[PDB]
Every structure is written in C-alpha cells, then in structure tokens.
C-alpha cells in the first residue's frame, strides 16, 4: 500500500479506490457484478479469462481508461496464475461450473483450481483472498458439486489461512440459473418436483447482496479468516417458491410429483448434450437440497448489507418470461409466497 | 505519528508579530492520508468521548472569537493598551541580569537559510548554505 495505492477522489469511476483486484471467473454471472462494483469506485481490476475476448466485452465499459486489464490464463498452468496476481492486493475466486465437461471435473474446478490460485497468491505476497464456497457444502451430500465444494473450502484454509470464505445460498438475478431455470420448465408442460417440493426449504439471496458483501469484505479489515453465510431474509418451500415464480410470469402452473430415482434418470438423459446442459443429475440434487441454517457463521448484516427480499426484486428477473398479455402487470399484482417462520 | 497539513494545504489563521490576524488559503490538498490539523483533534475527541463543539472551519473560528475576538479580524491591527499596568506588575519581582552578553542565534547569513522543518527539508536552502560557506567553487536558456 505505497503511494500509488492511497485512495483519492469521491468514489467515482475516475477515482482511485486503492484496490488492485484479480477476479478469476469474472466472465460469468457473479463475476460481472463484482467487476462492475470494483470499477464503479475506480479500482484496478485484472480479469484473467479462459474464453474468447468477444465474451469479455460486456466488462469493458465497467471501468475508466486503463482500469480493467485482461489476461489469458489456464486453470492447470501455474505460471499464468502468477502473472495475474503478483501485482494485486486482493484475489477473488469465482471459478465454478454447474456441470462436468470432458476436460474439467467438479473436483478440477472446485478443489484443484481454487487450491492452485490460493497457493500462488500466498507465494506472490497477496494480502487478501476471497473464496466463494456454497452454503450447502458438506462431505456427505448427494451432489458431487456440494461434496467437492466442502473439500475445496478446506484446502483453501490450509493454504491461505487469512482467506475470507463466503458461502452464498442459491443466488437469483437477471442472468441466473435459479429463477430462470424454474420459469423455463414451462417448455416441458408440467413442473416435476421431488416429494412435490413440500419437503425442501430454500433461502435464496439476491446477486447485488452477494456483490456488496464481497466488496465490503475487501475493505473491512476484520473479515480476514472468517467464514460468512450470505443468505436471504426469508425461507420458502420449493413448491411455494416455484409457484410464486409461475405466478409472477403469469404462466400456467401444473406441478406433479416425481420419484427421486426417476428425476435422476431424466437428468442423466439431459447430460448428454455437448453444450450447456439444460439440467443435470447434480442440479436436481442441488435444487431439492434444504438450505442449511448456520447460526454460528456471520451473515450479511455483519458486513453492513441489508438482504433484499425476493418479492421486491423478482419481477425484474421474471418479466422477461411473460407474454405480451402480461408484460405490463405490476409488482403489486401477485400475492407474496408463504414463508417458513422460525 | 498523525500526518497534518502544511501552510500551503489548509485555510489557517496566523497572527504576525504586530497582532494582525491573517488566514492562509488552500493551494493544494495534503499529500496522502494527511488531514487538516484541527480535524485530527476533532476526530480524536469524538473517538475519546469528548467531542469538541465544532464540526466545520467556520464553527472553529467562532470558538476563536470567544477566546480572543481579535483572531477573526483579518488584516486589522487591534491597538493594545495598559502599558502602565504591565510596568507596575513587572517591578514586583526583581530578577538580575546575567553577565553574559546578548548574542543573537543568527550572526551570519549561513544561519538564516535553515530555521524550521520546511527550510531544513529544502534542497535550495541546502544549496544556499553551501554557497555562502564554500562559495561558488550550466545556464544557457
């Protein structure tokens, strides 16, 4: 934090925030909001990308001249990771996938890449490390996604002890895979649900809430070495959450129960797609997994962020799924879902 | 160490040798994390639970008017009187003058170029002192 890393300005795009951040996986859902918030205050952002430069274009307006720097990196190349972090004061790890490719398994992107980044960051002298785990991560889950998340969350602690590990619940937003996933089930007629969605409880959180918590953790000096659980203000049943989704979108809602084994066989069929699968056996498990209640972990309120209710910010996500008949329906037209009081 | 502002980096009041109050004007802001001097104390008071009753420069100068009203009469010299009273009170105690002769601290010009933190940190005053002791032992444009 020498002379060039002293804050200046009034928090604008042409200010100097003093933050030099390397955001891995910045081309995805949770990464476009983090870069947007960092560049709003005038931060130096390094964005190592694996994909075509055409797919990084939406990130370019997010910063003043020279503030967003793009590098090409490989998850299995330890030298590329070092080039992208050796000048940074904070490293943010957002790498993840909801499916498995021929080249990267769940444990390749949740156990190995997170550990490789953490090790190189410590060897490079990086001061802050922010790792995004999952709320429902544990070694004894039915999902490799969550099983691998728990392992990765442990390797990071052993490599970067001062890391700040954040464990969000399912995140809903515009470019999400949670509310859009449920709405797009309408193509298949009915909405299958394991146990008819009556035995699953979900506590979704808003993307801006997660984005403001990560930014606060960077600036807050007491977030080092502390594990946070970013969850929403209300707990819903999966049946009520999905029913509310179809109510906002004004689409017919025709649920029907489906045995857990049957929903896996269907998921196996969809996994054959050589592109982004519509659904996988892992997503079915994740969707039908009760969100853990971790009272021992600090939450968003401990970083100064007020959790946004789903109702206030669900129409902005689901207005796209309505027909011309129901595009203009107002926010106050759909009664709120039923919550699970403590 | 609490960094502060120099006279070129704050709006501050100085009283010259004749009792005339004058205020500097901000030319450049303090270099890094340095802050205006009276704000550091104001911030310190709030943290210590003894918040001072002024938040802005105009309010601090209202306080100066309470302690000594002449401190907010800029470019004005306020006449001071009662020389007779001072003479009387000075004769109550009779101290003796030391035999040592009066010798100013600055006998020659080489003692004039460095008398404070700013001048001792200057590379031009350092050249002046070297010039008036060692002498002048390439200008084109």
């Amino acid at each position: 934090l020498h002379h060039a890393v002293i804050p200046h300005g009034k928090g604008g795009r042409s200010s100097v925030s003093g933050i030099v951040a390397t955001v891995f996986g910045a081309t995805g859902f949770l990464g476009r909001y983090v870069v947007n918030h960092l560049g709003r205050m005038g931060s130096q952002v390094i964005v190592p990308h694996r994909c075509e430069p055409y797919d990084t274009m939406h990130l370019r307006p997010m910063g003043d001249l020279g503030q967003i720097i793009f590098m090409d990196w490989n998850g299995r190349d330890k030298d590329s990771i070092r080039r992208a972090v050796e000048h940074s004061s904070v490293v943010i790890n957002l790498v993840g996938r909801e499916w498995e490719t021929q080249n990267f398994d769940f444990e390749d992107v949740f156990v190995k890449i997170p550990q490789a980044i953490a090790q190189v960051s410590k060897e490079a002298g990086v001061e802050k490390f922010i790792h995004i785990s999952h709320l429902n991560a544990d070694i004894k889950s039915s999902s490799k996604y969550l099983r691998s998340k728990a392992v990765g969350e442990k390797e990071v602690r052993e490599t970067f002890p001062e890391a700040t590990i954040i464990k969000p619940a399912e995140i809903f937003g515009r470019e999400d895979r949670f509310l859009n996933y449920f709405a797009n089930i309408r193509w298949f007629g009915g909405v299958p649900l394991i146990s008819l969605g009556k035995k699953t409880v979900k506590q979704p959180v808003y993307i801006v809430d997660v984005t403001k918590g990560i930014i606060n953790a960077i600036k807050d000096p007491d977030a080092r070495g502390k594990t946070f659980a970013f969850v929403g203000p209300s707990r819903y049943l999966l049946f009520d959450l999905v029913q509310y989704v179809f109510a906002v979108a004004h689409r017919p809602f025709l649920p029907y129960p489906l045995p857990h084994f049957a929903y896996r066989w269907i998921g196996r069929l969809f996994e054959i797609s050589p592109f982004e699968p519509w659904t996988t056996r892992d997503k079915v498990e994740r969707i039908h997994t009760t969100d853990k209640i971790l009272p021992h972990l600090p939450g968003l309120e401990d970083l100064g962020v007020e959790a946004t209710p789903l109702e206030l910010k669900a129409i902005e996500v689901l207005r796209r799924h309505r027909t011309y008949r129901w595009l203009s329906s107002e926010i106050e037209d759909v009664q709120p879902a039923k919550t699970i009081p403590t | 160490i609490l960094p502060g502002a120099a006279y070129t980096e704050k709006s501050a009041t100085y009283v010259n040798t004749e009792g005339r109050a004058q205020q500097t004007k901000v030319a450049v802001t303090p270099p890094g994390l340095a802050r205006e001097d009276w704000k550091i104390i104001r911030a310190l008071s709030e943290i210590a639970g003894m918040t001072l009753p002024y938040d802005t420069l105009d309010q601090v100068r209202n306080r100066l008017e309470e302690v000594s009203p002449n401190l907010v009469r800029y470019d004005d010299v306020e006449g001071a009187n009662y020389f007779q009273q001072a003479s009387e009170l000075s004769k109550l105690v009779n101290q003796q003058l030391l035999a040592d002769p009066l010798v100013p601290p600055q006998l020659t010009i080489k003692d004039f170029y460095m008398t404070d933190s700013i001048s001792r940190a200057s590379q031009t005053m350092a050249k002046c002192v070297k010039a008036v002791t060692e002498g002048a032992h390439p200008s084109i444009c």
């Binding site: 030099v20 130096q44 720097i69 992208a84 940074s88 004061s89 | 390439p138 084109i140």
Partner: protein
C-alpha cells in the same frame, strides 16, 4: 543509452521507471513498454565543438527557415564552450 532497473524494466530518457512494489507495472504484462532508444542527451554530446574565429557567433539550427530562431552566442569566456540554447551545438574561439 537505455538502462534497466533491477526488475528489468527499461528506464526512459526522462528517468521514469516503476518501482518493485508498484502495481502499475501490470499494464505491461502481456505487452511491452515503449521506450525510445535514441537518447537526445547522448547524441548531442557526440557532436564536435566547432572552432570559430570571432567573439560572437550565431546559430540558426541549420537549414535557415527550417531551423530555429537565430540567436547569438558569446565566446569570451575561455573556461567553457558556448552552447546554443535551442539545438545544443557548441562553439569555441580559435586559440582565443
């Protein structure tokens, strides 16, 4: 000529070089730092001092109207060469 600090970054003719801990070096990762290798201070020093048999000489920079404003240079001082304030050429008086 072009030097290199311990970190290996070339020092410009204005003496500019990022320190070891300066994050701004990251702008050169995957790219290059543009440094002009023809240092003017070095090249002008290679020019020889011209001998002139007069107290006062004038320089217009060469080329007439394609040079610089015509200035006059005094050569009385024998302990140094007279230097043009525009182009840097040096002059001396023949055996004074």
């Amino acid at each position: 000529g072009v030097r290199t600090s311990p970190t290996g970054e070339k020092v410009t003719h204005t003496g500019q070089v990022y320190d070891d801990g300066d994050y701004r070096k990251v702008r050169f990762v995957g790219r290059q730092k543009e440094v002009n290798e023809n240092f003017a201070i070095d090249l002008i020093a290679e020019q020889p001092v011209s001998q002139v048999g007069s107290r006062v000489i004038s320089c217009d920079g060469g080329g007439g109207a394609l040079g610089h404003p015509r200035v006059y240079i005094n050569l009385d001082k024998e302990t140094k060469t007279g230097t043009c304030g525009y182009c840097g050429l040096q002059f001396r008086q023949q055996h004074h």
